[PDB]
Every structure is written in structure tokens, then in C-alpha cells.
Design an enzyme around this catalytic site. Structure first.
Site, mmCIF file in Angstrom:
data_model
loop_
_atom_site.group_PDB
_atom_site.id
_atom_site.type_symbol
_atom_site.label_atom_id
_atom_site.label_comp_id
_atom_site.label_asym_id
_atom_site.label_seq_id
_atom_site.Cartn_x
_atom_site.Cartn_y
_atom_site.Cartn_z
ATOM 1 N N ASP A 91 48.868 35.301 29.761
ATOM 2 C CA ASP A 91 48.666 34.755 31.106
ATOM 3 C C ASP A 91 48.756 33.231 31.067
ATOM 4 O O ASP A 91 47.768 32.532 31.275
ATOM 5 C CB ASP A 91 47.300 35.191 31.658
ATOM 6 C CG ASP A 91 47.134 36.697 31.700
ATOM 7 O OD1 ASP A 91 48.112 37.396 32.029
ATOM 8 O OD2 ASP A 91 46.019 37.182 31.409
ATOM 9 N N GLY A 92 49.961 32.726 30.813
ATOM 10 C CA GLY A 92 50.203 31.291 30.681
ATOM 11 C C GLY A 92 49.829 30.760 29.310
ATOM 12 O O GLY A 92 49.428 31.518 28.426
ATOM 13 N N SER A 108 47.971 28.057 33.652
ATOM 14 C CA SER A 108 47.085 29.224 33.674
ATOM 15 C C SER A 108 47.443 30.063 34.891
ATOM 16 O O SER A 108 47.377 29.580 36.020
ATOM 17 C CB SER A 108 45.619 28.797 33.758
ATOM 18 O OG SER A 108 44.761 29.925 33.830
ATOM 19 N N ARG A 109 47.808 31.322 34.662
ATOM 20 C CA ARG A 109 48.280 32.205 35.734
ATOM 21 C C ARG A 109 47.161 32.726 36.643
ATOM 22 O O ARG A 109 47.443 33.207 37.742
ATOM 23 C CB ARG A 109 49.090 33.371 35.151
ATOM 24 C CG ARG A 109 50.322 32.904 34.388
ATOM 25 C CD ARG A 109 51.434 33.940 34.344
ATOM 26 N NE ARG A 109 52.367 33.757 33.228
ATOM 27 C CZ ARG A 109 53.308 32.816 33.121
ATOM 28 N NH1 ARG A 109 53.492 31.904 34.075
ATOM 29 N NH2 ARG A 109 54.073 32.787 32.025
ATOM 30 N N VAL A 110 45.907 32.627 36.199
ATOM 31 C CA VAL A 110 44.751 33.051 36.997
ATOM 32 C C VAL A 110 43.673 31.957 36.973
ATOM 33 O O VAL A 110 42.498 32.221 36.714
ATOM 34 C CB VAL A 110 44.197 34.414 36.506
ATOM 35 C CG1 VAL A 110 45.230 35.511 36.674
ATOM 36 C CG2 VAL A 110 43.709 34.345 35.056
#
Ligand SMILES: Nc1ncnc2c1ncn2[C@@H]1O[C@H](COP(=O)(O)OP(=O)(O)O)[C@@H](O)[C@H]1O
Ligand SMILES: [Mg+2]
Lengths: 524, 50, 165, 125
Positions: free
Chosen positions: A330-331, A355-357
């Protein structure tokens, strides 16, 4: 541990370093796939091995694990008929352990080969995970259950940022309820042996061993252990996850795991593809990292956060193993070599990192300040390329604040960032930001006999940390009280402390100023 | 080898563009300041011609 | 009466059995172990359950038989509030913050007490008096005895000379 | 181990170990990995380099030479070696040809003891 024998499945035929093939014994029993087998090196001693190929002939491909020098052709081979189980629990903490489970000198078991949580088993990541870095925790925030990659060249701070993230948990873990404690699992795949010892001492001195267990497969140890080391690391974390507790898993590093898996695959005649790796080298890292997750309220709400490290050669992200792990995680947190040598440490390339979240992962207080910082640094980076604006002044101070050796406490970080956001370090020069930040955290100028008169908010009281996390700084409870603390600190620092810089233009005072300011970079 | 050097050649031109773009944009500001003139001009040197 | 989780499945609202487990507490780290066991059996903490936990944090000594380094009942307590407010989405009632005020005056950390009476007065519109005078007593206790802040850090005039350690 | 002593080791060149194993590994019938090296490249260096270390009994202090083939530092033979070392000294050709000897490019170099704890504060700064 000493594994459980059952039936004598065959004899050893060929050996090729850390790989072998067997001939079946009379009867042709046939061992099960992916199971452990014990080779009798002597009457008293055994040597473990994992089954990787079940050929049509009856022959069985083995990956050697223990006592590789003692393995010979013609030796008897006993089977377990079971997948690899290892010692797991709270009793394993504060110790160094193999992928097979044997402790290195210096508890119900769990399967290493396990399926990841399904769709309805997981939930959205909400609980934050503090690395203890102002650069990371604002811009690239890691949530509990997230998989956040660490990429960059050799000697860019890939291990240090991962190890200091484990050390950052001790200050929280000591104070908090043990339900929400971040138990860490540092996996050391293919590393040098003394490097594991120095991390053990570094974890011990900061009280991390209490809340940490060290998986270790060093460069001396074979490819079979290196291959299996991250899998044994997650198994130990999943115990805490499935029993409603939060966990951290560092793999240092997956690059050396892949090389170990390539050795195993090539030696057993598995057809190679891109950069000589087998077909399933993507599948290797994918099933590892997917076992790291954030479970639902229905299954405890526990977590395993993953910090896989992946070494790049001369900032080349186009390599097969690097590109695979980026597409799974996730990134990433990219560590640039030019930023490292330039001064910025940790050398976090914010443009390349992601960062994807991020937003949902952050704390309510940290989300308030960090949302603005994205707007300021975006304009600062653009205007730096193409006369000082307010964004140009305040943007440059953030860059000075992001430099740090050891990890910052959540209170000490967010207040020094909040000061820069509302513009308390505008009149303060760029070189004296670390001296300004040091005098904010450890000392205090208002109380330093005079203009104090704050009823509750001070920096010496570390317990306010958790009140800030609840209510945030931008809130009627703490806003007016905080802005006093900063107004007292700025006015006194500019008047009494920064006045020296116009003065000090002599030998033995300019050098004394330097040695003071250089030590301020280390302590946040 | 070739993968690294052709990237570093490409990284060279990226720095080249950024620095030359700084000259472009700085000379626009000077050109905007300088064109504050074309509207005026000429009438100052009427009797200079004679 | 009825409730559903994020997916929309049925959830166990039967809180009372798990409440009496938290009352037999002894040491406050065991309360967290119970709070885990409810969630595991699809039974999310009720507003009364958090208050029942907050009671155990106040009454007992710390984690278990042996002491942990830098114990803080307040930090363990304020973490639990952060869990119920933000993540679980539950506003703590008047009982919640009264347990917090008790621990400030009991342990002697009056400076926190000044911050949390401001909290308790605002929003939730309640001034419990009993503890306000007990908190103000500890404030005057620090002044008259010797000094209120750390003391050795405050008086020492730095200015160029500050130790880095 | 036996005599209990501080000792120096000088391996010129450690690439030639890896390269020598690359010859036999082909003839032994192993499938080659990246850039035509043996698949056991990391394992070969592993068992060799791990023996070179400071024990409780004595202390080896090994200087090694490492050939970077075709001036390609991303090549497996040096790249794998870099992880094992305490002070990595990197020599650049462009630095040599410009006139600077020794040809040490200080940005690509690193040392573990470059630290305020080990060396003095004045040294580090
Ligand atoms: N944030 C930092 N500030 C100062 N020095 C650092 C920082 N992070 C790492 N270092 C230094 O950089 C060196 C290499 O760090 P390391 O974590 O081993 O990088 P890598 O894992 O990429 O080899 C170490 O000697 C360490 O002291
Ligand atoms: Mg490292």
C-alpha cells in the site's frame, strides 16, 4: 524444536549444496508436499528439510535447513507428514529465533503455511501506527494492518527507520493498556551476523525486547532458512492478530529472500524467467504480505502491519523484484541517496513516497496539521524550482524540522509542527530551528523565571499527549492555552537567545555555536 | 551498465531543462518590466531628430 | 434495542455477562483482555462497559504482579476514551470523565486535573465540585511545600549554556 | 581462535573467488542466475565472509579488494558483497582520470563507525 518422525520415506540420492533429491524406499510410501522431513545424519542427530518437488519417478526434491555439512548420500530420511509449525506466543518475546523455531543463545504452535484473511474477515484501517518521524507520520502515514514498503539504496537508512519505528512503540506501550500495544517482529533475512547483534543490543537498551521478537536467518545460514524467514515472522504476528492484538512485522529484506528463493528454484530445475527468477517469485511476496492485514470487529479487530524493505541498485525501481513488491504493498517510503548525503536524515523523498490509505490512518489531531502541510510543501517545491512568500518561509522550516536521528514522541512532534503551521518560526532563522525545538521540548522559557501563568498546558507534562490525541490542538479546550505557550517561547527565544547571533563573531564562540547546533539535530 | 548511464544521461537533461526554464521565467519578468515602455517611447526624442 | 455491524450482520448486544467479568478485575490489564474477548465473540463494548473498565483502572494497582516501567493509569485511561470516541463512534457520558478527574487527585497529578475540569465543564456542562476543591488543594500543596514544576530545570538560567546529554 | 590475537587479513581480490565459482558452477550443470553468475552467489559469499569476523576469542580485521566489472556497481558480485562490509570504500574512474589519487568517491562510500558515539563529536561534525 525436535520434530516428530513417523515413517521412513526414502534414501538421499544427490546433494548440491543446500538442495537434494531422494529415492523412495521399498514400498514407495510417498511423502506429502511442503512438509518437513528429518534426515538421519548420525544415529543420534537429525537434519531438517522441506519438500519442494514430487517427481513422477518417485523421487522427492528437498531443501536442506540444518546440519548441511553432515548430510550425505545414502542416509535414511524420516517424514513428519505435517506442515512446518513453530513456537509462538508471549514467551518467545525478547529472544532470537530461527525460521524452524530453535532459539539462538547469544506456547501453542502455529502453521507457517497459512491462508490470509478473506474479504468479510478484514476491515478498513483506522488505528494509526506512529513511526515517530514528522516526515513520515504527516505525509506518508502508516495505519495498523497496512503494508508500507521501504525502498532505496544501500546506506540510505532503510533499517534505521524500521528499527526506530519499533523503538518508538516502547514509550506508548509502557503507558497504554497492553490490548493496544504494538508487539514488533524484526525479521533479518540474509544479513550479516554482527548486524543482528548490534540491533539486539540497540533494542535491549531502549527496552524494546520486552515488546519485540527477532526472527534471524543470517548470510552464513542456508537459502532454505532465508526463503522461509519472513513466513515464520508473520506466523508469530498472526497469533497476536487472531487473538485481538496489534502487531508489527519488519522484513529486512525481501531482496535477499528472493535471491535465496531463486537459488532454490534454479538448483531444482524450475524454469527461470525475468532476471533468472522463477515464475512464482511474485506469488512468493504476495502471499507473505497479504497475511498482514487489519481484521474486522467480528474477529477481534487485531492487526499485523508490514514494513517490507527492498534494496534498489542506483535508484532503479524498474527491477523485477522491486516492481513486484511495489504493486503488492500500500505505497512506499522512498529513501533517496542524494538527500542522505545532502543532509536530510531520514532521507525521505516525499514526492516519490506515498501512502495509499493515509488520511483514514492518521490521528484526529495529526490529520488537522498535516492537511495544511501538503498545501504548503506543494507550493514551496514549485516556487523553489522556478522574493520570499509566507509559504516559502514556513515551508523551509518544515524541511529543517524533518531532520532527526531518533524517533520523536507524538506530543513533541505535533506541537513543533503546529508552531510552524501558524507561523511561530517565521522570525526565527532556518539554522536555529533545532535549537528552537530543543528548548521547546526539554526546557521551557516561560517557566524559566518570568512570564509563565499557564494553568495546565506545558511541555514537561508528557501526559497531555493523550488529551491532544482526543481533542486536537484546534479545539476550544487547548487552543488558547497552547497559543500562550508558543507566544512566550518565541518572544523570549527571539529576544534573549537569538540575540547572540548578531553578537557572536569570534573564534571559540562561532565554534561553540556550531557544536551546540549540531548536537541539536540529533535530539528532537 | 547501459540501464544506469542512459538514465543518468536523461537525468542530465532534466536538470538542464529546469535551469534553462529558470532563465526563461526570469527573463519574462524582465520582459514584462521592459515592455512598460512601448506604450510610451519615441515622443521623448522629437526635437532630438531635428 | 437491535444493532448491526459495518457489513449488516446481527451483533450481540447482551453486555451484562461481560460486565461482571470486568468487575472481578484485581489488576487493570485483565480488563483489556476481557474487552478483547467480547469483540472476538461479536459483542462490541457498550457505553456502560467502558465506564465499568474505567472503574477498574482507578481502583486496582497497575498491570499485574510485577510493575511496568513508567506506569500511567491516566494514559491507559485516555487511550480507552480515544477508542470509544473516534473508532467505535460513542460519546462518553458524564460518568466517563468523572473517573478521569478522580485519578488526577488520587495520584496527585493536579496539572492534568486543571485541564480535565475545563473539559468536564465545557460541552458536557457539569462541574462536580467535590474533586475541584481536592484538586485545588493539591495545587496549593505544591506551592507552599517547596515548588510546583520540576524545580531544578526551571531556576537554572541557561542562555548559551544548555546541556545536551 | 587458538592463539587469541588481533589479526589482519588481505584478500586481493574477492571478486576472483566469486568469478572462480562461476566457472565451475557452469560445468557442474547448474542453471545460471542474473548476469551469468552461479545461483549460489549469495551463499558462496555468505559462508566465506561470515567466517571473517571478530569472535570472543580473537579478532580478524580484513581489508578486501572488490573488482567492479565494467564499472557496473549494480552487478551482483559487488552488490552482494556491500551488505557484508563495515567500511565500504568506493573508487571511481572519473575521479582517477581527473587527477585525484586515491580515487575515492566519498558520496558512494560509507562506514558504520561514522557515528557520534564511536568517534569524537568534532570528528563527526
Ligand atoms: N535518521 C538518521 N539520522 C542520522 N543518521 C542515520 C539516520 N538513519 C540512518 N542513519 C545512519 O546511516 C547509516 C546506514 O543506516 P542503515 O539503516 O544501515 O541503512 P541501510 O539499511 O539502507 O543500509 C548508519 O550508520 C546510521 O547511523
Ligand atoms: Mg539495512
Amino acid at each position: 524444536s525436535f520434530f516428530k518422525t513417523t515413517e521412513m520415506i526414502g534414501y538421499v540420492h544427490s546433494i548440491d549444496g543446500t538442495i537434494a533429491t531422494l529415492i523412495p524406499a521399498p514400498g514407495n510410501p510417498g511423502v506429502a508436499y511442503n512438509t518437513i522431513i528429518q534426515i538421519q545424519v548420525s544415529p543420534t542427530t537429525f537434519a531438517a528439510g522441506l519438500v519442494f518437488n514430487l517427481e513422477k519417478d518417485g523421487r522427492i526434491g528437498i531443501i536442506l535447513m540444518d546440519n548441511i555439512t553432515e548430510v550425505q548420500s545414502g542416509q535414511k530420511v524420516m517424514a513428519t507428514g505435517q506442515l512446518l509449525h513453530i513456537p509462538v506466543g508471549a514467551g518467545v518475546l525478547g529472544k532470537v529465533v530461527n525460521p524452524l523455531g530453535h532459539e539462538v543463545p547469544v506456547s501453542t504452535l502455529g502453521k507457517v503455511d497459512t491462508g490470509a484473511p478473506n474479504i468479510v474477515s478484514r476491515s478498513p484501517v483506522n488505528y494509526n501506527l506512529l513511526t515517530g518521524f514528522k516526515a513520515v507520520d504527516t505525509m506518508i502515514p502508516i495505519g495498523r494492518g497496512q503494508r508500507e514498503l521501504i525502498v532505496g539504496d544501500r546506506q540510505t537508512g532503510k533499517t534505521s527507520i524500521a528499527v526506530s519505528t519499533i523503538i518508538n512503540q516502547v514509550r506508548i506501550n509502557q503507558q497504554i493498556l497492553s490490548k493496544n500495544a504494538v508487539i514488533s517482529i524484526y525479521v533479518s533475512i540474509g544479513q550479516r551476523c554482527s548486524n543482528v547483534a548490534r540491533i539486539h543490543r540497540l533494542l535491549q537498551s531502549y527496552g524494546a525486547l520486552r515488546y519485540t521478537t527477532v526472527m534471524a536467518a543470517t548470510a552464513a545460514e542456508p537459502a532454505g532458512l532465508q526463503y522461509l524467514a519472513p513466513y515464520a515472522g508473520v506466523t508469530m504476528g498472526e497469533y497476536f492478530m487472531n487473538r485481538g492484538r496489534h502487531c508489527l512485522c519488519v522484513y529486512d529484506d525481501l531482496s535477499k529472500q528472493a535471491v535465496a528463493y531463486r537459488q532454490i528454484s534454479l538448483l531444482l530445475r524450475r524454469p527461470p524467467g525475468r532476471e533468472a527468477y522463477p515464475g512464482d517469485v511474485f506469488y512468493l511476496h504476495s502471499r507473505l504480505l497479504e497475511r498482514a492485514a487489519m481484521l474486522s470487529p467480528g474477529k477481534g479487530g487485531g492487526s499485523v502491519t508490514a514494513l517490507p524493505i527492498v534494496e534498489t541498485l542506483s535508484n532503479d525501481v524498474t527491477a523485477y523484484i522491486v516492481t513486484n513488491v511495489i504493486s503488492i504493498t500500500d505505497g512506499q517510503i522512498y529513501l533517496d541517496t542524494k538527500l542522505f548525503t545532502g543532509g536530510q536524515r531520514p532521507a525521505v523523498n516525499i514526492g516519490l513516497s506515498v501512502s495509499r490509505v493515509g488520511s483514514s490512518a492518521q490521528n484526529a489531531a495529526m490529520k488537522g496539521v498535516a492537511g495544511k502541510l501538503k498545501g504548503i510543501l506543494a507550493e514551496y517545491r514549485k516556487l523553489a524550482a522556478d522574493v520570499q512568500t509566507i509559504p516559502m518561509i514556513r515551508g523551509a522550516r518544515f524541511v529543517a524540522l524533518f531532520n532527526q536521528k531518533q524517533p520523536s514522541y507524538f506530543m513533541n512532534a505535533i506541537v513543533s509542527l503546529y508552531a510552524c503551521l501558524n507561523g511561530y518560526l517565521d522570525d526565527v532563522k532556518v539554522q536555529y530551528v533545532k535549537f528552537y525545538e530543543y528548548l521547546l521540548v526539554h526546557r521551557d522559557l516561560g517557566i524559566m523565571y518570568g512570564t509563565a501563568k499557564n494553568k495546565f498546558f506545558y511541555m514537561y507534562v508528557q501526559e497531555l499527549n493523550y488529551l491532544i490525541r482526543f481533542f486536537t490542538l484546534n479545539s476550544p479546550i487547548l487552543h488558547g492555552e497552547l497559543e500562550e505557550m508558543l507566544k512566550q517561547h518565541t518572544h523570549l527565544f527571539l529576544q534573549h537567545y537569538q540575540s547572540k547571533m548578531n553578537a557572536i563573531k569570534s573564534e571559540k564562540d562561532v565554534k561553540a555555536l556550531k557544536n551546540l547546533l549540531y548536537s541539536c539535530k540529533r535530539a528532537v | 551498465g547501459k540501464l544506469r548511464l542512459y538514465k543518468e544521461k536523461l537525468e542530465g537533461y532534466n536538470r538542464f531543462y529546469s535551469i534553462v526554464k529558470t532563465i526563461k521565467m526570469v527573463t519574462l519578468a524582465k520582459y514584462r518590466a521592459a515592455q512598460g515602455r512601448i506604450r510610451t517611447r519615441d515622443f521623448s526624442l522629437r526635437y532630438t531628430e531635428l | 434495542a437491535k444493532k448491526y455491524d459495518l457489513f449488516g450482520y446481527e451483533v450481540d448486544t447482551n453486555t451484562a455477562p461481560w460486565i461482571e467479568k470486568i468487575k472481578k478485575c484485581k489488576y487493570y490489564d485483565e480488563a483489556g483482555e476481557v474487552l478483547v474477548n467480547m469483540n472476538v465473540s461479536n459483542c462490541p463494548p457498550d457505553i456502560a462497559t467502558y465506564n465499568a473498565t474505567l472503574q477498574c483502572i482507578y481502583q486496582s494497582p497497575s498491570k499485574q504482579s510485577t510493575p511496568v516501567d513508567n506506569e500511567s493509569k491516566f494514559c491507559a485511561m485516555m487511550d480507552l476514551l480515544e477508542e470509544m470516541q473516534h473508532r467505535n463512534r460513542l460519546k462518553p457520558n458524564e460518568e466517563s470523565w468523572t473517573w478521569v478527574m478522580k485519578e488526577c487527585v488520587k495520584s496527585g497529578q493536579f496539572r492534568l486535573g486543571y485541564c480535565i475540569q475545563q473539559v468536564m465543564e465545557t460541552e458536557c456542562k457539569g462541574c462536580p465540585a467535590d474533586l475541584v476543591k481536592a484538586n485545588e488543594a493539591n495545587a496549593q500543596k505544591a506551592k507552599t511545600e517547596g515548588k510546583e514544576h520540576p524545580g531544578h530545570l526551571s531556576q537554572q538560567a541557561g542562555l548559551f549554556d544548555v546541556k545536551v546529554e | 581462535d587458538v592463539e587469541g590475537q588481533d589479526v589482519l587479513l588481505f584478500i586481493d581480490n574477492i571478486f576472483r573467488f566469486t568469478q572462480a565459482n562461476s566457472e565451475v558452477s557452469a560445468l557442474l550443470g547448474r542453471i545460471p542466475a542474473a548476469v551469468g553468475y552461479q545461483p549460489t552467489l549469495a551463499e558462496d559469499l555468505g559462508q566465506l565472509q561470515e567466517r571473517i569476523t571478530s569472535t570472543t576469542k580473537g579478532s580478524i580485521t580484513s581489508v578486501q579488494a572488490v573488482y567492479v566489472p565494467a564499472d557496473d556497481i549494480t552487478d551482483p558480485a559487488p552488490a552482494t558483497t556491500f551488505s557484508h562490509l563495515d567500511a565500504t570504500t568506493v573508487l571511481d574512474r572519473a575521479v582517477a582520470e581527473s587527477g585525484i589519487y586515491p580515487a575515492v568517491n566519498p558520496l558512494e562510500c560509507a562506514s558504520r563507525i561514522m557515528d557520534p558515539d564511536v568517534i569524537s563529536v568534532d570528528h563527526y561534525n
